[PDB]
Amino acid sequence: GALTESQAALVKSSWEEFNANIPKHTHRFFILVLEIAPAAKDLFSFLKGTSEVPQNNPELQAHAGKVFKLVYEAAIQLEVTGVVVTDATLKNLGSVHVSKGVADAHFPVVKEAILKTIKEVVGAKWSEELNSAWTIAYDELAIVIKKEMDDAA
Numbered sequence: 001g002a003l004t005e006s007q008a009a010l011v012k013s014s015w016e017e018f019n020a021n022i023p024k025h026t027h028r029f030f031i032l033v034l035e036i037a038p039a040a041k042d043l044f045s046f047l048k049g050t051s052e053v054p055q056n057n058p059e060l061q062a063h064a065g066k067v068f069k070l071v072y073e074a075a076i077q078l079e080v081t082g083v084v085v086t087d088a089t090l091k092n093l094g095s096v097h098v099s100k101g102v103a104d105a106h107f108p109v110v111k112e113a114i115l116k117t118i119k120e121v122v123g124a125k126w127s128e129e130l131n132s133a134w135t136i137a138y139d140e141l142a143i144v145i146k147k148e149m150d151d152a153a
């Protein structure tokens with residue numbers, strides 16, 4: 001697909017829509033996650049000892065926000081520049097994943113959880129051209145973090 005001027009315009013537009021509601025979209029995101037894979041729960045300090053996914057836990061919100069931001073930034077950088085750039089932050093990300101017991105097979109869990117979250121976020125404006133655009137941008141960003149975990153192991 002590439003990432004045409006027209007495709008990037010489509011991701012930016014759809015992310016602005018996500019940030020517009022953090023406590024919802026982030027608690028939804030963790031439920032989509034636990035639906036796709038229940039065992040994932042013991043991983044999260046803020047999920048451990050609990051029985052349900054807390055809805056107003058700042059730790060949880062801060063966490064999930066950071067995750068979508070990073071995927072959007074990735075799409076822009078792809079249209080302008082043609083790539084995703086690896087920095088300090090992505091590198092530290094890779095460390096903390098490993099301390100916490102996270103593996104590669106966990107990633108399609110969080111992808112489908114994000115496509116399904118964005119399909120839910122943009123509703124009727126959904127196009128093939130847009131699905132194509134978020135897919136490209138996640139894929140391209142995961143490729144980069146997985147890279148940094150393996151390196152923190």
Ligand code: HEM
Nearest residue numbers: 040043044045046063066067070100102106107110141142
């Ligand atoms: C491109 C995809 C991903 C991005 C952009 C991302 C981003 C992040 C960030 C930014 C943090 C630190 C948050 C903090 O300091 O507050 C974090 C922590 C963490 N992540 Fe991920 N992540 C991704 C995929 C995954 C996957 C696939 C899993 C496994 C289910 C996972 C499990 C965790 C855990 C257990 C922590 C520690 C949280 C703690 O106990 O408090 N992440 N992630």
Ligand SMILES: [O]
Nearest residue numbers: 063064067110
């Ligand atoms: O995460």
